[PDB]
A paper describes a structure:
The membrane protein FlhB is a highly conserved component of the flagellar secretion system. Flagellar FlhBC consists of a globular domain composed of a four-stranded β-sheet surrounded by four α-helices.
In the case of SalFlhBC the final model comprises residues 229–353 out of 219–383 in the crystallized protein, with a cleavage after Asn269. In the model of SalFlhBC helix α1 is longer and has a kink at the highly conserved residue Gly236. Although the kink may arise from the crystal packing, our data show potential flexibility of the linker around this conserved glycine residue. This region in SalFlhB is rich in proline residues, making it unlikely to form any stable structure. In the SalFlhBC crystal α1 primarily contacts α1 and α2 of adjacent molecules, while in the AquFlhBC crystal α1 primarily contacts α4 and the cleavage site between β1 and β2.
Numbering used by the authors:
A (entry chain A): 229 to 269
B (entry chain B): 270 to 353
């Protein structure tokens, strides 16, 4: 089956988890309002 | 610009260590400091602890034990703040 070949594509999978790092990062930033204190500098 | 930011959430029950909800540098660090200030989240400059938390504390987890005392000192600071 060509369905498996397209499903397995390492290249489609690498973009996909590139966009996840970005997406989970954004989910991180949207949780900042839940914080009680921000430590900096 | 500027280097490090760590956002903590104190535990749901009052007697457990706080967790990291966000950390970053330096654009990210800046953009956390910004959202925090925008949403009136108290922000303390404590450069040694910020670099440390940033190095060692895992997002979504309880801060590490090496850093409890220091993060408890940040909490006393948050209490000083609640009085003008
Ligand atoms: Na809270
Ligand atoms: Na883990
Ligand atoms: Zn979103
Ligand atoms: Zn969230």
């Amino acid at each position: 089956d060509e369905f498996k070949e397209s499903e397995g594509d390492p290249h489609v999978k690498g973009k996909i988890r590139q966009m996840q790092r970005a997406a989970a990062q954004r989910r991180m930033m949207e949780d900042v309002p839940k914080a009680d204190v921000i430590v900096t500098n | 610009p500027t280097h490090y930011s760590v956002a903590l959430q104190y535990d749901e029950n009052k007697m457990s260590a706080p967790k990291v909800v966000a950390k970053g540098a330096g654009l990210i660090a800046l953009r956390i400091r910004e959202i925090g200030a925008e949403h009136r989240v108290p922000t303390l400059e404590a450069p040694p602890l910020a670099r440390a938390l940033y190095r060692h504390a895992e997002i979504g987890q309880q801060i590490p034990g090496q850093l409890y005392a220091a993060v408890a000192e940040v909490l006393a600071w948050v209490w000083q703040l609640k009085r003008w």
